[PDB]
Amino acid sequence: AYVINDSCIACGACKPECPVNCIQEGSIYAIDADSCIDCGSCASVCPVGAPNPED
Numbered sequence: 001a002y003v004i005n006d007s008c009i010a011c012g013a014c015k016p017e018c019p020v021n022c023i024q025e026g027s028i029y030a031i032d033a034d035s036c037i038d039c040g041s042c043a044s045v046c047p048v049g050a051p052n053p054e055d
């Protein structure tokens, strides 16, 4: 799964780009790890590179 790190500026760009809609809005956005397919689309549109493969 991917994880949205502290860089997140809560722009909202990644949510509509997630093919399985597993991103939730918050102070910083968060991924529902169990549904994430590691497609990387969120990482692709993020202006600050917050979404990265989980550690």
Ligand code: SF4
Pocket (backbone or CB within 6 Å): 002, 017, 018, 019, 020, 021, 022, 023, 031, 035, 036, 037, 038, 039, 040, 041, 042, 043, 051
């Ligand atoms: S990697 Fe894909 S499936 Fe996982 S949160 Fe990002 S866009 Fe959604």
Ligand code: SF4
Pocket (backbone or CB within 6 Å): 004, 007, 008, 009, 010, 011, 012, 013, 014, 015, 029, 045, 046, 047, 048, 049, 050, 051
């Ligand atoms: S696109 Fe990037 S900065 Fe914007 S909400 Fe998603 S993770 Fe946060």
